[PDB]
Amino acid sequence: MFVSDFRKEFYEVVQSQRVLLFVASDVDALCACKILQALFQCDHVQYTLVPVSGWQELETAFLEHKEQFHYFILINCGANVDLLDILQPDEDTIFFVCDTHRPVNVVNVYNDTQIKLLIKQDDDLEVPAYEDIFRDSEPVEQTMRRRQRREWEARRRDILFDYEQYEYHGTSSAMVMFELAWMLSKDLNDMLWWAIVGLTDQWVQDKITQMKYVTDVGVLQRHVSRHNHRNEDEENTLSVDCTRISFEYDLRLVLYQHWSLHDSLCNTSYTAARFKLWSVHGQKRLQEFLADMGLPLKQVKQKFQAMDISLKENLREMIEESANKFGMKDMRVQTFSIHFGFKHKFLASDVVFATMSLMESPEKDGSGTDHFIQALDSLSRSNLDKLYHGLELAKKQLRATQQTIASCLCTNLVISQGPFLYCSLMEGTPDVMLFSRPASLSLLSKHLLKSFVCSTKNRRCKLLPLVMAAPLSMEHGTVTVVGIPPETDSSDRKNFFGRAFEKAAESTSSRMLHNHFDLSVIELKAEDRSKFLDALISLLS
């Protein structure tokens, strides 16, 4: 069931109890976690944080802890599966699920005793009616009933199929948690920023539509203005500090405030794809764009911070003018920035890329948990050192992304299988270890598809979805496979590959695991890849 009162039904229930907090490995989840942690600190809630990358870790951790805890909180995991069936818990165990994954499992929706969904009830939700999916030598009296039961069960299969076909995401969990803090009158300025970063994570990863993003930006604008007014109230005692969040109609250029304009232009998907920067011709057109701006060469190639103050104040208008001249209409974006002092100013997307690079780091200097915690720590104002380190890792990730895309396109490795495009990375692919985790591979695939649609002349191919594979375990001969929807500005960002992969694996008896919280990312036996993809082609044709 859904929670109608976050205070009485959730927070006041758990704050006096011992709580196990499961947190998925995405920035929105980290941000939601930071907010809840700050609340739990204020109220001295006894809890244990268990970071989880996928279902196996969660299920294992649950077995390890189910005896010492009866109150569980799941952040960005659990909503899209029959949680009671998978975990097989005791009757007294309560699960609070704050997860953006859609669709919500019907059992999670209609269970009243153990599943408590911390999900806004006015989210995009189209749940089936209870009557359609749950029930309570023979004469005609009995056989007619049998016939009706069979027809009901048949409709039920169709109804649940339609309901579970497309995966997508609802409102940011960080935003939901911020609302809780607001209700508790404990919404610190830091929490509002974390809510913003969480929303921005969804946007960066194309998890939500442009319309939903703009709508939610509008909501957060209200809170930013309320906080600004609060920071001017002399009688206010809550979160009295100098930390200022500001709404920004800023440039669609990644990390541009932390390296050169040239680097940002070359490593932003929007411009890299549209200028076709994998080609010399493309690189030439970019130089013509920079020439049309009339900006000096030194000012473009040097770090942004060392730019003439007069040029910084005109850059938004200058770049947008040249952009309009080249027919680019979306150089400007609605977002937020946070200011600490001096040059310590960060756009929301900067923090997303930094936090993501820390969390998804493939380094051996620490385990996945260490990196997760480092990412979680980087969100605290207390020290910006981790954030700045994250920004350096982000630059590397972005450069490697551009190089990988160039290799894929110039080596002609993005090939239509009919109903979908296919491409893959191999063990010998440079920087493959930067793209071997679900999150990193999925984001790479979306960036690659964006560049591909700009590159291709084939009108049919422009509208195709993409399937992308990378090496998982060489020892066990497994690969990770991701599926993403067709790339369009107006996309509803809904994804059918989860159930498509499932049916393809079943009809071929392929050895496959749905370990990621998104069903559109699977682990597959390399030996089965051939028949698996063959079945998938037939299925989607």
Long-range contacts from 230-237, C-beta under 8 angstroms, 24+ separation: 231/189
C-alpha–C-alpha distance, residues 522 and 441, integer Å = 11
Give me the half-sphere count of Cα atoms (radius 13 Å) on the Cβ side of residue 6: 18
Task: Say which residues have a Cβ less than 8 Å from residue 268's Cβ, sequence separation at least 6.
Answer: 252, 253, 254, 256
Cis bond leading into 103, ω under 30°? Answer: yes
Provide the 10 A C-beta neighbour count for residue 509: 10
Spatial contact of 267 and 400, defined as CB atoms under 8 Å apart: no
Coil vs helix vs strand at 294: coil
Rounded to 5 degrees, φ, ψ at 43 are -100, 5
- Annotated resolution, angstroms: 2.1
Write out the two tokens for 366: 């620490």
Rounded to 5 degrees, φ, ψ at 345 are -120, 135
C-alpha to C-alpha distances, 533 to 251, 441, 468, 537, nearest whole angstrom: 40, 18, 11, 6
C-alpha–C-alpha distance, residues 21 and 75, integer Å = 8
Write out the two tokens for 152: 């009901």
Q: Position 110: which residue type? A: Y
Provide the 10 A C-beta neighbour count for residue 525: 17
Spatial contact of 515 and 56, defined as CB atoms under 8 Å apart: yes
Return the CA Rg of the chain. Answer: 24
H or E segment at 371? helix 368-378
C-alpha–C-alpha distance, residues 436 and 440, integer Å = 7
Supply the angle between the helices 368-378 and 385-410 in degrees, to the nearest 10. 120
Closest CA to 179 of 189, 192, 167, 197: 192
Spatial contact of 453 and 462, defined as CB atoms under 8 Å apart: yes
Strand partners, 115: 95
Query: What is the DSSP secondary structure assignment for residue 437, as one 8-state letter?
Result: S
Quick one: 73 exposed, middle or buried, by C-beta within 10 A (0-12, 13-18, 19+)?
buried
Closest CA to 481 of 539, 540, 417, 436: 436
C-alpha–C-alpha distance, residues 453 and 488, integer Å = 9
CA 67 remoteness from chain centre: 32
C-alpha–C-alpha distance, residues 433 and 441, integer Å = 10
Alpha helix locations (H) across 43-139?
55-65, 83-87, 106-110, 130-133
Provide the 10 A C-beta neighbour count for residue 463: 11
- Determine if residue 431 is left, alpha or beta; phi over 0 gives left, psi from -120 to 50 gives alpha, anything else beta: left
Rounded to 5 degrees, φ, ψ at 294 are 75, 20
Q: Position 366: which residue type? A: G
Closest CA to 79 of 95, 101, 62, 57: 101
Spatial contact of 134 and 152, defined as CB atoms under 8 Å apart: no
Closest CA to 36 of 9, 78, 62, 6: 6
Closest CA to 47 of 96, 1, 87: 96
Give 314-365 as a DSSP string.
Answer: HHHHHHHHHHHHTT---SEEEEEEEEEETTEEEEHHHHHHHHHHHHT---SS
Domains of the chain: 6-133+164-169 (3.40.50), 190-400 (no CATH), 414-540 (3.10.310)
Q: Which residue is it, tokens 């964006």?
A: 450
Query: What is the DSSP secondary structure assignment for residue 260, as one 8-state letter?
Result: B
What technique was this entry resolved by? X-ray
Spatial contact of 480 and 468, defined as CB atoms under 8 Å apart: no
Give me the half-sphere count of Cα atoms (radius 13 Å) on the Cβ side of residue 112: 0
Supply the angle between the helices 348-359 and 368-378 in degrees, to the nearest 10. 160
Q: Which residue is it, tokens 């104002």?
A: 381
Give 217-239 as a DSSP string.
Answer: HHHHHHHHHHHHHHTT-TT--TT
C-alpha to C-alpha distances, 133 to 147, 158, 164, nearest whole angstrom: 17, 10, 13
Quick one: 376 exposed, middle or buried, by C-beta within 10 A (0-12, 13-18, 19+)?
buried
C-alpha–C-alpha distance, residues 497 and 165, integer Å = 8
